[PDB]
Curated annotation (Swiss-Prot):
Keyword entries, A-Z: Chromosome, DNA-binding, Nucleus, Phosphoprotein, Repeat
Keyword Zinc among record annotations: no
Subcellular location: Nucleus; Chromosome
GO biological process terms held by the UniProt record: chromosome condensation; negative regulation of DNA recombination; nucleosome assembly; regulation of DNA-templated transcription; regulation of double-strand break repair; sporulation
MF-aspect GO terms: chromatin DNA binding; DNA binding; double-stranded DNA binding; molecular adaptor activity; nucleic acid binding; nucleosomal DNA binding; phosphate ion binding; structural constituent of chromatin
Source species: Saccharomyces cerevisiae (strain ATCC 204508 / S288c)
Name of protein: Histone H1
Job description of the protein: Could act as an H1-type linker histone. Has been shown to bind DNA.
Family under the similarity heading: Belongs to the histone H1/H5 family.
Signal peptide: none
Domain H15: residue ranges: 3-77
Length: 78
């Protein structure tokens, strides 16, 4: 039902909408937020909000995000 969407959701929902088991990346999620979702993903500054949501969800042991030459977001507790 209606409950105010949040950037975390774009990540959690993105991981649920990603439909990938090997893992996804920052773009694979923004893509979902912009294409699988509205321009909220096809915008610009939002890209910064989703990032905070990733670190926020990942930092809280919500999603998994490595680093390397980039970073792949994976839905799963630490």
């Amino acid at each position: 039902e209606a409950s105010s969407k949040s950037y975390r959701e774009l990540i959690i929902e993105g991981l649920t909408a990603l439909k990938e088991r090997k893992g996804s990346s920052r773009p694979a999620l923004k893509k979902f937020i912009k294409e699988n979702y509205p321009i909220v993903g096809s915008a610009s500054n939002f890209d910064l909000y989703f990032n905070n949501a990733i670190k926020k969800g990942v930092e809280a042991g919500d999603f998994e995000q490595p680093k390397g030459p980039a970073g792949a977001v994976k839905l799963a507790k630490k």
